[PDB]
C-alpha cells in the first residue's frame, strides 16, 4: 500500500501544503505543486499541494495542525494520498468565522484575513474545512460552508469569496 502514509509534524508550516520525500513522490508520480487528495478518519478528506522534503521519511507525510484536524487524524495515524489533477478554479466560496475566535474582533474579516490569505497562493479548499488565518490583533478560524464547484476547488484571483453573516460554532 504505497500511498498509505504515516502522519508526521510539519516543518515550514502552511495550511495548503503537505510534504513527501522525493522517492515517495517518484513512487506515486507526483510533481512539484501538484494538487493531491487526502483521506483521513470519519470519511473526512482534504485537498493539498504536495512539495518534496529531503527531511521526510519515505513512508511518512508532513502536515500541520490545520490539515490534521480537517482529516480528524493525529500524529502517528495513517492516511492515504492520491493524485488530484482535476480540481477546478472556484467560481465562489462561502466561509464563516468560528464564533470563539472573533469574540472581540472589530474589522473587516475579508480585508484583514481572507484577502491576503488567498492572495495569489492558489489554495485548494474543501467544503467543511476549518482553517486558521493569522493577521490583525489575533488569528481567526473560518469554516468553509460551501464551494462552487462542490465540494472542492482552487481559490483563484477571480474566485468570489463570500464571508456572510453570523459566526458559527463547533
Amino acid at each position: 500500500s504505497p500511498n498509505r502514509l504515516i502522519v508526521d509534524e510539519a516543518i515550514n508550516e502552511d495550511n495548503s501544503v503537505v510534504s513527501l520525500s522525493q522517492p515517495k513522490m517518484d513512487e506515486l508520480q507526483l510533481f512539484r505543486g501538484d494538487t493531491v487528495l487526502l483521506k483521513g478518519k470519519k470519511r473526512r478528506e482534504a485537498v493539498c499541494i504536495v512539495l518534496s522534503d529531503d527531511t521526510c521519511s519515505d513512508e511518512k507525510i508532513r502536515m500541520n495542525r490545520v490539515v490534521r484536524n480537517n482529516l480528524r487524524v493525529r500524529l502517528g495515524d495513517v492516511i492515504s494520498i492520491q493524485p488530484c489533477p482535476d480540481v477546478k478554479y472556484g467560481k465562489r466560496i462561502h466561509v464563516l468565522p468560528i464564533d470563539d475566535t472573533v469574540e472581540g474582533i472589530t474589522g473587516n474579516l475579508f480585508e484583514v484575513y481572507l484577502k491576503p490569505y488567498f492572495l495569489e497562493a492558489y489554495r485548494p479548499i474543501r467544503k467543511g474545512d476549518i482553517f486558521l488565518v493569522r493577521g490583525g490583533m489575533r488569528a481567526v478560524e473560518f469554516k468553509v460552508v460551501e464551494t462552487d464547484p462542490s465540494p472542492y476547488c482552487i481559490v483563484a484571483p477571480d474566485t468570489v469569496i463570500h464571508c456572510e453573516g453570523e459566526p458559527i460554532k463547533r
Binding site: 510533481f31 512539484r32 505543486g33 495569489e120 497562493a121 492558489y122 483563484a156 484571483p157 477571480d158
Partner: protein, 79 residues
C-alpha cells in the same frame, strides 16, 4: 535536457509542456502568448515561495529561472 512545466491558465485549464532547459524564459512567455495570454496583459507566477517570473530578464535560461526539472507555473492577469 528538458524542463517539465505544468501551466495553469486563468480559466483553470491545465497544460503540461516541455522546453529545453537551455531555452530562454522568453520561450515560455511566447508560448503562453500563443495560447491567447499575451505578455503585455498576463504574467507568470510560481508558489512556494511566490516568485514573479515576469520580473526577470527574459534572456535568462529556463534553468537560471529556476523552473528545472519541474515547476507549476500560474498564468495571471496583471494588476
Amino acid at each position: 535536457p528538458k524542463a517539465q512545466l505544468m501551466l495553469r491558465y486563468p480559466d483553470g485549464k491545465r497544460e503540461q509542456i516541455t522546453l529545453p532547459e537551455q531555452a530562454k524564459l522568453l520561450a515560455l512567455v511566447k508560448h503562453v502568448q500563443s495560447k491567447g495570454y499575451p505578455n503585455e496583459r498576463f504574467e507568470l507566477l510560481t508558489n512556494f515561495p511566490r516568485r514573479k517570473l515576469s520580473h526577470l530578464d527574459y534572456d535568462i535560461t529556463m534553468q537560471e529561472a529556476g523552473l528545472c526539472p519541474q515547476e507549476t507555473v500560474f498564468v495571471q492577469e496583471r494588476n
